[PDB]
Write a protein that binds this ligand. Structure first.
Ligand code: ATP
Ligand code: ATP
Ligand code: MG
Ligand code: MG
Lengths: 584, 584
């Protein structure tokens, strides 16, 4: 079994001014069933986060050790923490959330059939039968109830078979018969050699009789720590006799909460500093401090198994909530039909270039501004990514690449195919076969580079408010330097370097080089030369040298390697912004 | 006192296929302390939502009556419902959330000093002293703990002094000494004549002795309803003897949950249809059905008091989280400085018009695309608006106008002032005093009309992903018809009507009429006329004739009344999309 030890644990929270949650706290949690009791605000979820390695260590002032050695790197992949506020995906099902966490947190030497045989056993043992194929709700569509969602969070961290299991009040939201059935399941599990540390509120006497160790937190200090059977006899010596209460857990928390002003105002030298100084002078503290001195990432599944399940769960959210993908395809058709109907029948005339160089500007501007909706990719599921990363589900690189494919394929690749096809059979652009696919590839790369910039601004962010705003004003900034309204050669030298940062300038140049190269506009001529007066812009090549565009075949693909270097750079910024996010 | 009565209550939920949550349920809840016990998934939050008029009545199949009459329209402003999942604003404080709900749900005949004197009494009685001036947390920054946030939700619906109070498990998350101190506060409150209906999980024996009425739900049916003192003696006649349990609430839920598969698998003709048929033949059902047959918006504060508190709370969120407003002002300065540095020193030349008509296009394009960030104004607080509307805090029109002023002033009015000023002392536009303020007013109206369109697409929506996408592609659509790249007069008649829907076409026309009227460009002339050739475009009036812009003073303000009619229409769509939102 695992003997988790914690020695001289202090904590501090900056609100600046620091507040001392969790003063000097010492204890040992041997394999069994270790309960933490105490009032609300006592520091029970703070102690249980320190012990589960989920607090920022800048405020933490002690050492937690498993078996006398410090915590390994594969601790989240060997332990479980059921947290208090039930971070469950509410577009999946009770069985689907159990299928996801069994797939990524159990090793793949087990069959997918035998993984589901263990999911059925946990659904039966937790009593989730009538809601197993019913959706966990979100905060707008109700679904599964609060106690049935609580048992889903318990069961997701229970198929994984952890050796140390932490539970943040596992039976609040449960009734007195399901709460006893859950701790009798844990007591059965704890007798296989598991260390189970939990906090609990209002346990009944049949639940309290299961405890192997008792911890009593109040105001951040320890009122008692030791066995639960020798807990009632500890308070008899301190002047508190038991049986005005048939339940000892109702007796223990009437002592350590008598100083509370709710209890003093309703039906009724500090009590905390008196009860805490009794404990450090007692024999239970000398027993544990003379025992503490004797004691004093390699994920479960591979990268490709986690990549094939983050994207599998991401595609099921898009096939269940296909609002933004149907609306993407709908307003891409009616925009491609309108752009094709305005510039319908492009002539080779004196005004056939500003129609052509004005239609390829609105194709590029559309693919850039459509990518502002990629800001919400890592923002709406930030709480679920942070919870499931510290729980040991996946790498950051598995989640990052798996969630890319739910934004790359259905929102950027596919609406750049049907947008290129629609404005090709109705405009009359360069009619060859290769220039159709160069135009399709160019519209994809400005959709990928502008989406990678949407991820680089918005990764690791809680709201979309700063990121959408910096997304659109950076695209108005990149549209000044696109090379259409104001000429890039007449820009002064201290500002003309900003044209190399412009995503629309690379797309519009590659669309201009693909379209105008080999065209001729001056035919229709007289015995005299042509008879407009700029004088004339006959060849598509001389239009390109006026813009400053190279006529070599490198002058086309210079713009496609500069958009590929903007995809790699902006997706490395966006990856590291999720990697170095503070997830405590 | 209020005698709430519910008769033949049924419910149904479409998952399509219908599921019968809450079968035939009858009962009476007289002034006192009425508890609802039962297992998880029994239908306790569904009965407590039916009774509080928070369920969609398309599935509801009975009648709930207060004092034998149907409930009035001012029921949410006379009752209180503490819901289960603690919808609290986490950027405010425990005292600030209590100050907000006392200001909008207590009448203003009470002084603001005496409202805060009652807030201090509720903070003392609930034991919220050490966290009263500490922030309730969000899901990313922890703050107040789970039980201390639970008591904030209780206290917000308790300063209001409701006559009927519903509580959705008010003591889950509380410990056994604060849970007793909360129900002793309710028992003191219930003896003034209040009807207090609650559901409860795992009550101790001192809490169970406070109940005046007991209701036992299991799988949607009623296992018992009547007094709580005569509840133990009801199950003695049905074959269940009590004292293997010293707590009767632990005895009642071991009967009605013995059919649960968690209890059958752990330490161990249907039981529900056997226990439900015993009750309908009992004397407690004949007593209540022969008593049920004998029985069978005007907000608290005014519109202006609610408008001055929704905006007061909205400004405190912007002064506490000023990320998107500082970033708005920063990238408006460096964009106005870049636009002013590219077109620096606008000259009156042959190419001084496409510099001028190209700089007023990027000023209009910026004010439209900056307004995409107005999409999440009503989206990120949709759960808090829906909760606080059905709780009777404000009207929709109070919240709508109060939340406009947190998006109108700091994000659209102020960044259109400093954007107009910056590109005026460095460009050299129309140098009069009135044309500076016409240019400032024009940039404000395209920022208001484009933000009102951001609200019209995004009001009543849970994600910003569809609405940001339809925002930016509608602005690319409106930029084709702005009248710069493709000429509006050469557009065919079946497509040229779409130029009247274009917000940038109205702003850019009013910016062109303000700028070019009275300018002259052909000076610098010879003995010959000018000697470039298209031929020339000398006066600014003949440039405006070529664009198709009226030269009358109405031709300027035609564009400002068409943007004002787009503000009124898009803010009426956005208001009605919050008004007719299904908030059940
Ligand atoms: N990061 C933090 N910021 C502000 N306050 C904190 C923070 N962490 C802890 N606290 C405070 O410390 C006290 C204990 O916190 P904790 O969340 O551990 O309580 P708890 O014992 O779990 O209470 P409950 O049982 O009601 O959930 C609380 O009163 C809380 O307000
Ligand atoms: N809108 C809904 N969609 C799907 N299922 C529902 C819906 N409403 C109720 N249910 C189901 O009905 C049962 C009872 O729902 P309810 O939320 O009332 O449970 P409860 O008694 O409050 O449970 P708990 O005490 O655990 O919160 C639950 O099992 C839930 O799955
Ligand atoms: Mg807690
Ligand atoms: Mg409930």
């Amino acid at each position: 079994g695992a003997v988790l030890s914690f020695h001289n644990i202090c904590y501090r929270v900056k609100l600046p001014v620091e507040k001392e949650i969790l003063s000097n706290i010492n204890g040992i949690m041997k394999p069994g069933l270790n309960a933490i009791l105490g009032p609300t605000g006592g520091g029970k979820s703070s102690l249980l986060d320190v012990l589960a390695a989920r607090k920022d260590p800048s405020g933490l002032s002690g050492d937690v050790l498993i078996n006398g050695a410090p915590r390994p790197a594969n601790f989240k992949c060997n332990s479980g923490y059921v947290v208090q506020d039930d971070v469950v995906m509410g577009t999946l099902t009770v069985r689907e959330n159990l299928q996801f966490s069994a797939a990524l947190r159990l090793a793949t030497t087990m069959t997918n059939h035998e993984k589901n045989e263990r999911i059925n056993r946990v659904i039966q043992e937790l009593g989730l039968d009538k809601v197993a194929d019913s959706k966990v709700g979100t905060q707008f569509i109700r679904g599964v109830s609060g106690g049935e969602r609580k048992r889903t969070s318990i069961g997701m961290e229970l198929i994984t078979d952890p050796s140390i299991l932490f539970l943040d009040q596992p039976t609040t939201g449960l009734d007195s018969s399901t709460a006893n059935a859950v701790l009798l399941l844990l007591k059965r599990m704890s007798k296989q050699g598991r260390t189970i540390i939990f906090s609990i509120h209002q346990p009944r006497y049949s639940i309290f009789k299961l405890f192997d160790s008792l911890t009593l937190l109040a105001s951040g200090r320890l009122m008692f720590h030791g066995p639960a059977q020798e807990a009632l006899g500890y308070f008899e010596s301190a002047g508190y006799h038991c049986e005005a209460y048939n339940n000892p857990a109702d007796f223990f928390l009437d002592i350590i909460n008598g100083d509370s002003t709710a209890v003093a105002l309703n039906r009724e030298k500090p009590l905390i500093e008196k009860l805490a100084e009794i404990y450090v002078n007692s024999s239970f503290y000398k027993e544990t401090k003379a025992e503490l001195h004797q004691l004093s990432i390699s994920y479960t599944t591979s990268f490709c198994h986690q990549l094939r399940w983050v994207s599998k769960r991401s595609f099921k959210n898009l096939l269940g909530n296909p609002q933004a993908s149907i609306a993407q395809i709908i307003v891409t058709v009616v925009l491609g039909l309108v752009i094709g109907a305005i510039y319908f029948g492009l002539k080779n005339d004196s005004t056939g270039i500003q129609n052509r160089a004005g239609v390829l500007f609105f194709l590029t501007t559309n693919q850039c501004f459509s990518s502002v909706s990629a800001v919400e990719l890592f923002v709406v599921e930030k709480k679920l990514f942070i919870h499931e990363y510290i729980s040991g589900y996946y790498r950051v690189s598995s989640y990052f690449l798996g969630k890319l494919l739910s934004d790359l394929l259905p929102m950027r690749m596919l609406p750049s195919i049907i947008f290129t096809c629609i404005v090709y059979f109705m405009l009359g652009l360069k009619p060859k076969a290769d220039a159709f696919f160069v135009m399709m590839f160019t519209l994809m790369m400005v959709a990928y580079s502008a989406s990678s910039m949407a991820l680089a601004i918005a990764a690791g962010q809680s709201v979309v408010s700063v990121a959408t705003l910096l997304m659109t004003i950076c695209f108005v900034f990149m549209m000044i330097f696109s090379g259409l309204l104001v000429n890039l050669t007449t820009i002064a030298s201290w500002l003309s370097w900003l044209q190399y940062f412009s995503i629309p300038r690379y797309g519009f140049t590659a669309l201009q080089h693909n379209e105008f190269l080999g065209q001729n506009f001056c035919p229709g001529l007289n015995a005299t030369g042509n008879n407009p007066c700029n004088y004339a812009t006959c060849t598509g090549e001389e239009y390109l040298v006026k813009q400053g565009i190279d006529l070599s075949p490198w002058g086309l693909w210079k713009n496609h390697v500069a958009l590929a270097c903007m995809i790699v750079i902006f997706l490395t910024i966006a990856y590291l912004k999720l990697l170095f996010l503070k997830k405590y």
